[PDB]
Design a protein around this ligand. Structure first.
Ligand SMILES: OC[C@H]1O[C@@H](O[C@H]2[C@H](O)[C@@H](O)[C@@H](O)O[C@@H]2CO)[C@H](O)[C@@H](O)[C@H]1O
Ligand SMILES: OC[C@H]1O[C@@H](O[C@H]2[C@H](O)[C@@H](O)[C@@H](O)O[C@@H]2CO)[C@H](O)[C@@H](O)[C@H]1O
Lengths: 136, 138
């Protein structure tokens, strides 16, 4: 289910930090954080921690197809333990920090960054906070 | 126009803090922060600083009409200067803090607090940050 959605028509990429605090119920759950662009809610960046397998899967859903998966080895989450995920974008990458440590970066595939206007948080995450801040 | 909108289907009231940082582009415009109920966007709480007349107007839009206005006539904004608005609700009121000082409270008119799932920020404000955070239990 959709847990949280935000829309910022002026564009929240690049130069914005999104900080999500919360926790996940079981060690077989998953949640996702999506950055979506107009028109047609294409997913510029899909961040998907899968607790069943302890993998973070990142990808993009553009022109109605998932692209090449980028899977991160390290899994700094624990079921039912509060976490903090920060996603920050510059002109080249989305940068992911978890509990303040740099975890991965994801090269822009959707290159029209100003069209990225929507944030979606889905599935197994009990959100305690969402912060969307311009960092430059 | 719409500057920012957030949806939290589990309900933003009571007990959630919304902190908005930013500034106006003009000297004589206005902006608003609305809390809307699901479904159908009745406005449970409308927060409307008006910079031309230097007044903060609060009201609710239930059943397709505005209710009695509640006007502050204290106006701790100035145009083109960064401000911080914090809006919080408990079981009884919306609480409004501006730049860390309590400015006003507004008694709930929309009594179904759990239906309030949507936040909307309109017109003349250049947003630098929005933070939506649970107070109390989490
Ligand atoms: O690539 C992100 C999407 O993956 C989809 O699941 C993949 C799965 O990772 C892969 O192992 C294989 O089974 O093909 C699936 C394609 O459906 C998810 O369904 C989707 O939500 C994204 O996370
Ligand atoms: O009460 C909130 C709404 O006020 C509307 O304007 C009022 C105005 O403030 C009042 O003094 C009188 O003139 O009647 C109007 C009712 O339409 C705004 O149009 C609306 O945006 C709300 O702010």
């Amino acid at each position: 289910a959709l847990r949280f959605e935000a829309l910022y028509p002026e564009g929240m990429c690049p130069g914005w930090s999104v900080v999500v605090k919360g926790k996940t119920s079981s060690n077989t759950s998953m949640f996702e954080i999506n950055f979506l662009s107009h028109p047609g809610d294409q997913i510029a960046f899909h961040f998907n921690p899968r607790f069943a397998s302890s993998r973070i899967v990142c990808n993009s859903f553009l022109a109605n197809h998932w692209g090449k998966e980028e899977v991160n080895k390290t899994f700094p989450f624990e079921a039912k333990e509060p976490f903090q995920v920060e996603i920050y974008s510059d002109q080249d990458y989305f940068h992911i920090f978890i509990d303040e440590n740099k975890i991965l970066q994801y090269k822009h595939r959707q290159k029209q960054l100003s069209s990225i206007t929507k944030l979606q948080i889905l599935n197994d995450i009990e959100i305690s906070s969402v912060e969307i801040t311009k960092r430059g």
